Amino acid sequence: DLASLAIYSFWIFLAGLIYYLQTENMREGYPLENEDGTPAANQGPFPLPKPKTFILPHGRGTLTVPGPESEDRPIALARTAVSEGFPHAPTGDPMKDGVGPASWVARRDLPELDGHGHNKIKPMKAAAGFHVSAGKNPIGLPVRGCDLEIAGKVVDIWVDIPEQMARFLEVELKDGSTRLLPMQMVKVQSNRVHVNALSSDLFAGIPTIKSPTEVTLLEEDKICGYVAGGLMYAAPKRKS
């Protein structure tokens, strides 16, 4: 009957749909590889989808996926076993090298632009009309590291103009240079800003930005990467 028809029909629809859904999520990081980077033998039942090209807004070109994948940075890792499936140990300083939970991707070295073609993110001193409308204004508060020692001070808030959101705290170190600190990895308190991931001694290692009034996708990744990695690698310095 009709009902039987409809339901049998639907289970068929649903199956080609999953198939679709699945092949679309195969647009990045495919095809699969062996730990040595050579193409892996068994890529699953699903074919790579036919490429699609994204036309990017501020004459920043196009992007076609799937496409040629490459890390575009040397990875400081060495195998710890003779068969597949085991960890790869950092061969240096994982933090300094950017592997592990400290990994960063070679994003473009251009900043994210707003709908108008202006830099999406800006230090608040250069954002004409912006102010802390609520909560504790961090600016001026010391930054304390997980080792419970002061590392610097808050000399500005880099805001996301389009979302009116605080993205990073710009911290001044003992030598007078500054670093960005992701907003998402610090606790603003009444008398201090506490950073659990980094011990005071690692703040200097936080990668620097080439221009003082801009951050690029590459530098966001290298920074967030680094600060995140502290959680696992600063661990010996963290007390509480």
Binding site: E71, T80, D114
Partner: protein, 281 residues
């Protein structure tokens, strides 16, 4: 075996239990100590379930059903064929679930991300525990739990419901449903919004998030923003399930009568209780 960008992430560490012992992968999958735990609990449970199936004398999945002990057994142990098997199976499920959560924690650490996912999952686990542990205890027999079978479980739902009248009147049930509906609504729009920006009109340049925000400001006069909608989603979801637990944990424990009748409180407020006319006067 690895995604084109996976290797630099596959470093040692992050394990909660047992150091480097189980710190490794199997194909795409991460094992970890709890990798093993869940496997063991999952193996055992499925076994017991098959064992129930022979005692039942059917291999047909639409028929197979593992029932809790009958009320006469209260919160004591029961013979295998008479409810023990369900009790173990329930222990094993719990073991599986919790372990699966703790593995999520272990992966979280290795990758250096937040614990929001293990977190949210614990709500699912807590809803399940409400229906097979917290409610039966409080009620006083494993027998109030739902049976493990594809349709028999739908039956428990239907019977348990109709016991208190039309269950629609359970007030926390009303609230819990509003989230389920609301969440789906919000998943619908969020998915649609991002896609429409990323996949515009033919030959056009990729929209920007700013366009996304404008689109909603144009539509209903407010946009929660990109960070917002993700906070929103997590919340509606967790809330739906939170109220779902609540509506059950109260049902049969502190309220055992017809749910519709509980509304008489409102209608019988002394200031309008006796005023004639309307529906109730």
């Amino acid at each position: 075996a690895l995604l084109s960008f996976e290797r630099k992430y596959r470093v040692p560490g992050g394990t909660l239990v047992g150091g480097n012992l189980f710190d490794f992968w199997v194909g795409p999958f991460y094992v970890g100590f709890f990798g093993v735990a869940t496997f063991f609990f999952a193996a055992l449970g499925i076994i017991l379930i098959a064992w129930s199936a022979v005692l039942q004398g059917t291999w047909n999945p639409q028929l197979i059903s593992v029932y809790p002990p009958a009320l006469e057994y209260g919160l004591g142990g029961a013979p295998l064929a008479k409810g023990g098997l369900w009790q173990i199976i329930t222990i094993c499920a719990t073991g599986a679930f919790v372990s699966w959560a703790l593995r999520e924690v272990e992966i979280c650490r290795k990758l250096g991300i937040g614990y929001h996912i293990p977190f949210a999952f614990a709500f699912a686990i807590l809803a399940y525990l409400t229906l097979v542990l917290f409610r039966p205890v409080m009620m006083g027999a494993w027998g109030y739990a739902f049976p493990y079978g594809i349709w028999t479980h739908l039956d428990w739902v239907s019977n348990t419901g109709y016991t208190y009248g039309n269950f629609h009147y359970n007030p926390a049930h009303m609230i819990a449903i509003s989230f389920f509906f609301t969440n789906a609504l919000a998943l619908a729009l969020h998915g649609a919004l991002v896609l429409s920006a990323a996949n515009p009109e033919k030959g056009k340049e990729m929209r920007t998030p700013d366009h996304a925000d404008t689109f909603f400001r144009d539509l209903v006069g407010y946009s929660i923003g990109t960070l917002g909608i993700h906070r929103l989603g997590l919340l509606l979801s967790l809330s739906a399930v939170f109220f779902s637990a609540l509506c059950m944990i109260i049902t049969g424990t502190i309220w055992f009568d017809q749910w519709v009748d509980w509304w008489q409180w409102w209608v019988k407020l002394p200031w309008w209780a006796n005023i004639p006319g309307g529906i109730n006067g």
